[PDB]
């Protein structure tokens, strides 16, 4: 066999230990999920520093007057939310964020509402998105890409144990904190589902073929997306791209991918097993589950526990200015709370 008794027993015990962590993690999640927290701050607790983004609402850098600590506050206009048919998405996203707990998931620190708006007060990550670092550097070396990939593998293993499908993996949704580690943001398309689901959602370059083909699909779409992400991090561009989304979908369902000549054989083997159209052969979807991914040769040097514990030295630390340096400043359009409670019943649960 590939490993003798010492290696095989240590691996077995580590895998059993993961099961024990997940079982406890699921119990903590379900309590918060069945009994969500509400109204844990108010607007006048914060000073609006800078509008960091602007459809359904804006995201503003704010400063807690009491704490002094900075936060990223998502302001959602309740009427705009209702008019654009986003009630369930917004409720679900906040309910997931308040219930999950994992070191690579951006944290909801406060939530509340007033007559006009819904507010989600998140951890502020001044390093910004992986997207811009990746486009700036060009591509990440395989060890650098692997350090990020390991965190996503663990995060998906966590999320899938809770029957959550993430469905919007991409560098735009991965923030880099001040220790160089990944924070996943934007659970707007995440769904708690045990079996199949059918919604056409995601980003074109990251869509699994079974989504494109109008099939019912499951959590295996996140493992396909992991493959696109690893490819893009190590190549500098995604495996499937074209002028128009339709031509991207053609390449995705074709079952063909080409790799740069600088990809190691270990990497190409992993990516062929993730970017696998056949669901009965896609890593993450087989009898051994996530272990086929964790035990793959490309991850041989990965110390999964040390990554989870954040003991591994990051390959890259964004310039520690919090400064809005890594964000394109917008017109600070003020926030006004109507004298009348708008859309009370629709957002009772928020």
């Amino acid at each position: 066999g590939h490993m003798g008794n010492a290696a095989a027993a240590k691996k077995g015990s580590e895998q059993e230990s993961v099961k024990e962590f997940l079982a406890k993690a699921k119990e903590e999640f379900l309590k918060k999920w069945e009994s969500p927290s509400q109204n844990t701050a108010q607007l006048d607790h914060f000073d609006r520093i800078k509008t960091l983004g602007t459809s359904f609402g804006r995201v503003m850098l704010v400063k807690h007057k009491e704490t002094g600590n900075h936060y990223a506050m998502k302001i959602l206009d309740k009427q705009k939310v209702v008019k654009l048919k986003q009630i369930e998405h917004t409720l679900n996203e906040k309910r997931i964020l308040q219930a999950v707990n994992f070191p690579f998931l951006v944290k909801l620190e406060f939530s509340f509402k007033d007559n006009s708006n819904l507010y989600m007060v998140m951890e502020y990550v001044p390093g910004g998105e992986m997207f811009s670092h990746l486009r700036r550097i060009g591509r990440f070396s395989e060890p650098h890409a692997r350090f990020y990939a390991a965190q996503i593998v663990l995060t998906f293993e966590y999320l899938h144990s809770l029957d959550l499908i993430y469905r919007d993996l991409k560098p735009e949704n991965l923030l880099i904190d001040q220790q160089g580690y990944i924070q996943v943001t934007d659970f707007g398309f995440a769904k708690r589902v045990k079996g199949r689901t059918w919604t056409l959602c995601g980003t074109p370059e990251y869509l699994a073929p079974e989504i494109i083909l109008s099939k019912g699909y499951n959590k295996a779409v996140d493992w396909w997306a992991l493959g696109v992400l690893i490819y893009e991090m190590a190549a500098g561009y995604p495996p499937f791209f074209a002028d128009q989304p339709i031509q991207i979908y053609e390449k995705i369902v074709s079952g063909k991918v080409r790799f740069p000549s600088h990809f190691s054989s270990d990497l190409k083997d992993l990516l062929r097993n993730l970017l696998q159209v056949d669901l009965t052969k896609r890593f993450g979807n087989l009898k051994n589950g996530v272990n086929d991914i964790k035990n793959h040769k490309w991850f041989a040097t990965t110390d999964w526990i040390a990554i989870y514990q954040r003991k591994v030295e990051a390959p890259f630390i964004p310039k520690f200015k919090g400064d809005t340096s890594n964000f394109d400043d917008y017109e600070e359009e003020e926030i006004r709370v109507s004298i009348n409670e708008k859309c009370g019943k629709e957002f009772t649960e928020f």
């Binding site: 707007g188 980003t203 561009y237 791209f241 002028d243």
Partner: peptide, 18 residues
């Protein structure tokens, strides 16, 4: 090159969902 093709795609910027 593939890289040039990526540039030619017009999809080098931040990509929206849906």
């Amino acid at each position: 090159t593939t890289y040039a093709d990526f540039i030619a795609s017009g999809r080098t910027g931040r990509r929206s969902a849906i």
